[PDB]
């Protein structure tokens with residue numbers, strides 16, 4: 303028993319991290335097969351970031367200008383191209399540590415692990431969720447750009463995120479591995495305000511199921527609700543509307559605990575309306591929303 | 607910016623995990639050089655755990671009874687010995703993935719990462735603290751025994767914990783890598799109640815400094831306090847007494863923020879006395895105590 307904000311083992315990703323330098327800018331790159339993926343803003347100076355013309359800036363760069371280092375060994379760059387907001391640096395050597403991998407574009411509410419890196423070296427790993435406003439609440443300092451988000455299914459690493467920037471509000475924006483930003487964000491230093499950060503209702507419910515499975519049951523009540531009634535309360539508290547798809551996804555957790563999804567929604571409704579009254583759930587004093595129903599099943603069953 | 611409960615990159619430890627089976631019991635082992643370390647309760651049946659005589663149970667076991675598997679390859683056991691509550695299985699092959707390592711016995715209040723494993727396979731990584739009552743609040747299911755806790759300093763892995771058991775209260779107990787339990791716990795299925803789980807005051811203060819560094823400042827007040835006055839409040843709230851050693855350890859954080867340690871203690875005192883009033887600090891609605899002052903500096907500076 304016990305329930306923790308758990309990240310995937312980072313080893314498969316650690317073997318892919320490299321350092322990319324272009325001019326005076328150093329960030330991280332992801333080396334998979336004979337391609338190194340990195341944010342295209344590696345070609346910018348802090349001054350260029352105000353209004354950069356990436357195509358024009360890239361014309362002044364040749365293969366020899368991208369310095370790619372894996373550990374202490376230099377990789378030879380034999381090609382470069384820009385795909386959306388990422389650069390693809392073709393190198394002459396396939397990464398021998400390349401795991402089985404996929405590039406996936408995740409939906410808001412889905413979780414992933416981040417391997418924070420600096421100078422191609424890993425500093426730490428933590429679990430994130432893509433927020434409904436397409437930002438992530440990470441831990442990234444200057445030099446962390448190019449650090450990636452991923453999920454692991456047995457031996458396959460699904461890369462879903464690459465770090466690009468911090469908004470003036472302290473939240474983070476990045477792209478999928480095709481270089482398309484999540485949300486409306488652009489790789490420019492301009493007024494980019496994030497929209498409403500709503501709570502991921504289905505994840506909160508999944509975490510309430512995890513609480514019951516791990517012994518915390520004080521919040522269970524004698525009530526039930528309907529999807530429409532619950533959603534009226536969810537609207538009031540800036541929670542995402544719960545759908546029948548969400549109810550269906552919570553089916554296995556409902557089956558394991560014997561608590562019907564709508565009964566758990568009524569517990570959640572009372573928790574939103576009355577608060578925790580100084581109590582905690584799974585060591586938290588707020589309703590946690592960065593565990594998907596898949597994460598709860600995975601952690602509660604011990605999938606490796 | 608941004609502050610997360612971050613674990614160390616787990617790759618160096620992933621390469622050390624193996625599966626150990628003895629009879630019908632399968633748990634994890636740690637393969638370092640030509641020795642595999644695992645909990646001695648691998649030789650027990652669930653029935654033996656009530657009152658096990660480990661020396662007598664071990665007499666009935668030979669080298670060929672300990673099945674050690676690294677991935678899908680079988681390791682040959684050429685010796686076995688019991689050191690305290692761990693078994694040391696000498697194998698004929700040195701682990702080629704052995705990192706630079708140390709075995710350290712940590713003090714209560716210190717943090718470490720845990721690589722949860724099942725059948726020698728990693729499932730996830732999370733950050734823990736050794737509680738003042740010598741338990742850890744982990745996420746461990748049956749089969750996770752032998753999963754280890756560690757810290758990393760550049761290329762050296764300092765192993766500090768090996769998982770052995772869950773107390774009837776849902777908290778976890780384990781040993782250092784010499785097989786000595788943290789706290790008064792024994793590898794027996796008996797009434798083992800944990801003592802008072804006090805809050806790690808110096809860690810809470812370090813996390814308050816992290817909050818100020820990352821933009822959350824609402825809790826800063828116009829007050830100061832003394833070590834003795836603060837400790838009277840800390841006693842009342844089951845917080846560990848703050849010492850001058852703790853103040854000294856917070857020196858670099860005090861210097862970086864310009865907030866004197868005792869002024870931060872006065873903010874903490876007001877937070878204990880008045881609560882959060884429905885507000886949050888670094889996305890938490892309670893005072894976080896599983897970040898040491900070293901963790902805060904490390905994460906805020908980006909050490910790899």
Ligand SMILES: *C(=O)c1cccc2[nH]ccc12
Pocket residue numbers: 327328329330443444445446447448466467
């Ligand atoms: C990313 O790593 C990044 C973003 C902004 C500024 C900066 N300087 C160096 C690297 C960066």
Ligand SMILES: *C(=O)c1cccc2[nH]ccc12
Pocket residue numbers: 631632633634747748749750751752770771
């Ligand atoms: C540890 O992994 C462990 C503890 C208690 C019970 C159990 N059965 C198999 C393995 C275990």
